[PDB]
Amino acid sequence: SYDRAITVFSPDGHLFQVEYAQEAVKKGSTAVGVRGRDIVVLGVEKKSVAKLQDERTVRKICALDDNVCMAFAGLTADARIVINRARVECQSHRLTVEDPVTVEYITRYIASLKQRYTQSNGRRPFGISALIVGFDFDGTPRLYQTDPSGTYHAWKANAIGRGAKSVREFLEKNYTDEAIETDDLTIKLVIKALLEVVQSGGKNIELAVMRRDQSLKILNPEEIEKYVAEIE
C-alpha cells in the first residue's frame, strides 16, 4: 500500500500540489452558473464539436439528483469520478434522512471528499472545480462553487475554467436584480457572458436550465440560436 506524503507544506506557507491542481482547473473549459429569482442556469463553452463526436457522451452538465445538478471545469476523468461519489451519497442520504438532499449538504460532502484527497497519503488532488445548483426543500435557489482546495462557498453567480476572471468581472458589473427580473434575461445574461470568452457563439455553447419543480432541461440548439439572435 503506497503511503507516501504527496502534498506537504512549502516555505512561505503554501501547498504547491493544491495550486498546481488549480491551474489544471483553469486550462479547462469555461462554465458559467447564475442564480435567478426562481431559476438557476448553467452554461458551458464547447472547445470543439469535431463534426464526428457524438455530443451525447461529452455532456459536461449532469444531475446528481432530481433537484441537484452541477457543472465542472478540469480533468474530465476526475470529474466523472467525483460525480459518481456524489450520486451514491445523495441516495444514501435519501435512504437515511428520508428527505431530498440540500445543495448546501451535498456541496459539503463533495468538498469534504476533495479535502480528503489533498491531505491524504499516496493520492493526487482532484483536478476539478464544481458549480452546484439546486432548489432546496424551501424552494430558495442555491448556487455553490467548490475548488480543489476543498473550500466551498455560496454565490449569486460565478465562472470557472479558462476565461473565468474576465467573465466574472463581466458578471459583477452586469449582474443586477433587473437582469434577474425575468427568466429570459437570466438566460441571455449567461450567453453574453460566455460570448465574452467563446468566439463562435450559438454553436459553441451548451446551455441547461433548472426550474423549481421541473427537472433539469438542456436547451436545444434551436433554442440557443434563438436566444443568441435576440441578444444581437
Binding site: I6, T7, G13
Partner: protein, 233 residues
C-alpha cells in the same frame, strides 16, 4: 527527500514551522476574555460582491457554551471542528456533564501533530493542519479563552488576535485590555482593532461577531446588532 518528520540543525521541525507561517495569510480574528464573558470578532474578507457573505462562516459553535474562530486553511479547519463537536457530545453522553473549554481544546490539540508517513494508518494525516483556533466558552471556572497554534500548543490567554494582522492587533490589545474590562468594552475595543487592521472600510457585512456569557448560550450577532455596535464604534 526531507521526510515530513525531520529535524533541523536547531531541533526545529520543518513542517510545523511552515504551517505556523501559513497562518499569517489568513484574515484577522480577535478574542477577548472578560469576567462577564468571552467575545470573538473576525474579518470576513469578502473576495467578490457576487459571493454570498452568509456562506463565509468564520465563527462556529462547538457546544451551547463553546465557540471557535478560525484563520488559515479554512479547508483544514473543517476536520478540526468536527472532532471537537463529537468529543463534546461523547463527553456529555458518558459523564452527563459539559466538557470544559480546556478539555475540549486539549482534545482538539491532541488531534494536531498526530501525523506520519510510514506505519501510521491506511489513510492517516500526512501534514499538519494550517489553522489557528481561538476557543472561547464558559465552564465551571467561568469564561475561558484558549488559542491553539498548528504545533498542537494551546495556552489560555486573556486577549489575543490571530491572523495576518496578529502583530499589531496584539499590540493594540496590549494598550487597552485590562482585567476588569466588561463584555461591551471588550466588544468595542475588538471592533476598533479589527477596523484599524482591515484595509476595507468596516461595515456590517464583512465581520462576524459572537459572544458567550454565563447566562446565555453561544450567540452570533445578527446584522441588526452588528450595525448597532459599529454605529458607535
Amino acid at each position: 527527500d526531507r521526510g515530513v518528520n525531520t529535524f533541523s540543525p536547531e531541533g526545529r521541525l520543518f513542517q510545523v514551522e511552515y504551517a505556523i507561517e501559513a497562518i499569517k495569510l489568513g484574515s484577522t480574528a480577535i478574542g477577548i476574555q472578560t469576567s462577564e464573558g468571552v467575545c470573538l470578532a473576525v474579518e470576513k474578507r469578502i473576495t467578490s460582491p457576487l459571493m454570498e457573505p452568509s456562506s463565509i462562516e468564520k465563527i462556529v459553535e462547538i457546544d451551547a457554551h463553546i465557540g471557535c474562530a478560525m484563520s488559515g486553511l479554512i479547508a483544514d479547519a473543517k476536520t478540526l471542528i468536527d472532532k471537537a463537536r463529537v468529543e463534546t457530545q461523547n463527553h456529555w453522553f458518558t459523564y452527563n456533564e459539559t466538557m470544559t473549554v480546556e478539555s475540549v481544546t486539549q482534545a482538539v490539540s491532541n488531534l494536531a501533530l498526530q501525523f506520519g508517513e510510514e506505519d501510521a494508518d491506511p489513510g492517516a494525516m500526512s501534514r499538519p493542519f494550517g489553522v489557528a483556533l481561538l476557543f472561547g466558552g464558559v465552564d465551571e471556572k467561568g469564561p475561558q479563552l484558549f488559542h491553539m497554534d498548528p504545533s498542537g500548543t494551546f495556552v489560555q490567554c486573556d486577549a489575543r488576535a490571530i491572523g495576518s494582522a496578529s502583530e499589531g492587533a496584539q499590540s493594540s490589545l496590549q494598550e487597552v485590555y485590562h482585567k476588569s474590562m466588561t463584555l461591551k468594552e471588550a466588544i468595542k475595543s475588538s471592533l476598533i482593532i479589527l477596523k484599524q487592521v482591515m484595509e476595507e472600510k468596516l461595515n456590517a457585512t464583512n465581520i462576524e461577531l459572537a459572544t458567550v456569557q454565563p447566562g446565555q448560550n453561544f450567540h452570533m450577532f445578527t446584522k441588526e446588532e452588528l450595525e448597532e455596535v459599529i454605529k458607535d464604534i
